[PDB]
Amino acid sequence: VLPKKEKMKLRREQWLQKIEAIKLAEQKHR
Amino acid sequence: HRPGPLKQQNKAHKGLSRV
Amino acid sequence: PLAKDLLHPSPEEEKRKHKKKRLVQSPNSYFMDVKCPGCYKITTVFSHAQTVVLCVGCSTVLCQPTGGKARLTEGCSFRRKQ
Amino acid sequence: VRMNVLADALKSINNAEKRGKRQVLIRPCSKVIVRFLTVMMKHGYIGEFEIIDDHRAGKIVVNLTGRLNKCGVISPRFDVQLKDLEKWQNNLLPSRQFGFIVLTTSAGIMDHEEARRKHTGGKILGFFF
Amino acid sequence: AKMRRAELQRARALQSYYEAKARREKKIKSKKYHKVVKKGKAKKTLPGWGEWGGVGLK
Amino acid sequence: GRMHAPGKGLSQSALPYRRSVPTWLKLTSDDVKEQIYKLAKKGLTPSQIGVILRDSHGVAQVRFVTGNKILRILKSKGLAPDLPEDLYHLIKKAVAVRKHLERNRKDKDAKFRLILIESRIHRLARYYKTKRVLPPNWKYESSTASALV
RNA sequence: AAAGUUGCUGCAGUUAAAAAGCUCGUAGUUGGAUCU
RNA sequence: CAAGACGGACCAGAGCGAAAGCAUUUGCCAAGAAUGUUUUCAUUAAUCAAGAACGAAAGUCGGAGGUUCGAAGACGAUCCGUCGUAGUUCCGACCAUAAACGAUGCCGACCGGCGAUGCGGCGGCGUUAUUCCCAUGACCCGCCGGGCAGCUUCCGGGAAACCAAAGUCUUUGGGUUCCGGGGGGAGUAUGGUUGCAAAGCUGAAACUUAAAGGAAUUGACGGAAGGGCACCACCAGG
């Protein structure tokens, strides 16, 4: 289908995106 | 020419001293 | 689906489960008291008894051991106890 | 056979959380498991739990809430000197804000921030984010 | 009632034949067989009984 | 799972939560202990004593009533054997299998099962040597095996 | 160093290199719950 | 009448065994899983280097027996046929190898549905044992436990075939054993060791090469096969 390199990049990028989203959500609580 | 699925091809079995 | 109280199971489910796999395990056997047909004496017999049980005075076989629950002699009377 | 019941508890909770369950049963109970669950409770990750006491090792019914992404054990219980602690979180946490190394120290079972405040080290038990 | 009973007995027999064929096919792990079956799936009053029934006599 | 078999079965006994003696049991602790004494004088293993007391007299758990287990009760009076009952039964089974083997030499299944039995014997003997029940000079030997029974 | 092709962090072992014929079978490694 | 061999059909979607394997009746012998248990002991456990038991077939050394089949061999045809040696059968020693397969360690936890099957147990109306005079066997309904095997599934995983494990894995740690590190050289040389032998276990380097390998989807393609039509095709004829 598509090489595993950009699948790994997409997964780690979306994971850091959830990290940033939950960081902003938890910062909003203060 | 490339043989089709109907063509019978079996999968191969893989088996001095210092002084 | 995906929404039930595990802390409070109903009596039918907790009865239905295996005796070890309940919320708190509990046995399925019981002690029951038996009157011999030829006498009046009370004998307390395990439900799943592995020994043949003789009357202490009449020496009549009250129950015969089987694979699970004990097989009472016909004529004997029994009551669930506690 | 069954060794390290804390690993079994944390794996059960993680597998329950990934299916979007609300409530999970844990067997057997332990002191270390209860302290770990209290640590996750105080940070608002696993809600509420209640200990079912039979005359054996008990069981725990835990109310999952939804915030928890991954709870995990670290086996073996590596010693964590206070310097090495920093390295540890960069190995286990996806950020330097959230996630928790849980240490058993002589001041108790706690997280890495409280262990840094109390200025002590100990054995690493897990992490949760 | 009895007709559903006969239906259930027939269902038990048919499930026996089906599960026999299913186990026989599940043993087969060759990739050519699976490829061919995938291609195939993607491609898609009485005389007699009682007495002597004849011309001369019945 | 089983220590030498590939079986993994769940079946066992399940004790109830109520450790209290039931109200309908009128036997005192010393009466139960006297029954234990006369049963042991009849020559009974503590397992057999527990089964008989459960079935006929209605004593569900001897430790819940008397406060002590059967082997400790027999030990305080002194009516307890030198080697424990499970090791006794294992050694008796090993003696029986070895007798069958000396009569029947072709039974390699019996040889394999005898090896299983005496390995179980070695594990239990190691445990009993570690917790001082057996003397440290005790050792299971093939000819001395029938002498223990 | 890229290299996670030596892998403790941190690889793999159906079909690609690879799990021992099978089980009893000491040392070494790991070992349930519980005491303010 | 006799000798040796072998237990078909029943015979599976079966079962048992650690595996190799296991199908005539009867008796004896000693084991065994699962189930049941308000018995007992009370951590006695899991996994394997060393060392040891078992290990299809063929093979080797002593006997016995040699019906069928049959390596070799002698003949006749031109992968076959007639005869048949060693063997195939039994007892006692060795050898310890197979595609010895799930091409897939073992122990433990968690994680969908279904209705079938084998054993044990529990509850329950009914039909049967020529309405059985109570129980018992055979069926029927449901549940529980350990199994063998399926179907299904955006649980997730995988390169894909597919997997309820080959999942719970870059969000990377339950315990522990064996083992691979591009293709060849090469399971070779050498040494050790086991074996009566055949052989078994261990096992390189020099050198040489740019690949080796796994999975799946595919147009055209001289052709090939099934049919139909035609007295500018055929049969019988003019």
DSSP assignment string, E8-34: HHHHHHHHHHHHHHHHHHHH---HHHH
How many domains does one find in chain F? Answer: 2
Is residue F4 included in any domain, yes or no? no
F18 touching chain C per CB within 8 A: no
Q: List protein-proximal bases of chain G (any atom < 7 A from a CB).
A: 9, 15-18, 23-26, 30-35
Contact C80/C71 with Cβ under 8 angstroms? no
Cis previous bond, D76, omega within 30: yes
Distance of alpha carbon F25 from alpha carbon D100, whole angstroms = 55
The verdict on F118 and F145 lying in the same domain is yes
Contacts for F67-73: CB closer than 8 Å, 24+ residues apart? F67/F29, F70/F36, F70/F46, F71/F46, F73/F33, F73/F36
DSSP notation for C18-74: -SSSSSS---S--EEEEE-TTS--EEEEETT--S-EE-TTT--EEEE--SSS-EEPT
Residues near A25 by beta carbon (within 8 Å), at least 6 away in sequence:
none
Is residue F51 included in any domain, yes or no? yes
Contact D28/D4 with Cβ under 8 angstroms? no
Residues near C57 by beta carbon (within 8 Å), at least 6 away in sequence:
C39, C41
The verdict on F99 and F144 lying in the same domain is yes
Structure tokens at E44: 């898609």
The verdict on F65 and F105 lying in the same domain is no
Å between D97 CA and H195 C1'?
Answer: 70
Exposed / middle / buried, residue D110 (Cβ in 10 Å: 0-12, 13-18, 19+): buried
The verdict on F67 and F86 lying in the same domain is no
Listed residue (D91, D111, D123, D125) closest to D5, CA to CA: D125
DSSP notation for F41-89: HTT--HHHHHHHHHHTS--S-HHHHHSS-HHHHHHHHT---SS-HHHHH
The residue out of F65, F80, F95 marking a domain boundary is F80
The verdict on F65 and F107 lying in the same domain is no
Distance of alpha carbon A11 from alpha carbon D118, whole angstroms = 37
Q: What is the resolution of this structure in A?
A: 3.2
Q: How many CA atoms lie within 13 A of F70 on its CB side?
A: 25
Is residue F89 included in any domain, yes or no? yes
Structure tokens at C77: 């009377």
Contacts for A11-16: CB closer than 8 Å, 24+ residues apart? A15/D94, A16/D94
The verdict on F138 and F103 lying in the same domain is yes
The verdict on F70 and F104 lying in the same domain is no
For residue B6, what are the CA distances in angstroms to B2, B11, E22, E26? 11, 14, 23, 21
Exposed / middle / buried, residue D21 (Cβ in 10 Å: 0-12, 13-18, 19+): middle
The verdict on F96 and F147 lying in the same domain is yes
The verdict on F47 and F76 lying in the same domain is yes
Q: List protein-proximal bases of chain H (any atom < 7 A from a CB).
A: 12-13, 17-19, 29-46, 53-55, 91-92, 99, 102-104, 107-112, 115-117, 120-123, 134-136, 141, 143-147, 149-151, 155, 159-163, 167-175, 214-221
Helix or strand holding residue D33 (H, E): helix D31-42
Tokens 């001395």 correspond to: F144
The verdict on F126 and F149 lying in the same domain is yes
Distance of alpha carbon C17 from alpha carbon C9, whole angstroms = 11
The verdict on F76 and F104 lying in the same domain is no
Q: How many CB atoms lie within 10 A of CB F39?
A: 20
The verdict on F49 and F74 lying in the same domain is yes
Residue F101 domain boundaries? 81-149
Q: How far is CA D90 from the centre of its chain?
A: 18
Is residue F18 included in any domain, yes or no? no
Contact D12/D24 with Cβ under 8 angstroms? yes
Coil, strand, or helix at residue D123? strand
Structure-determination approach: cryo-EM
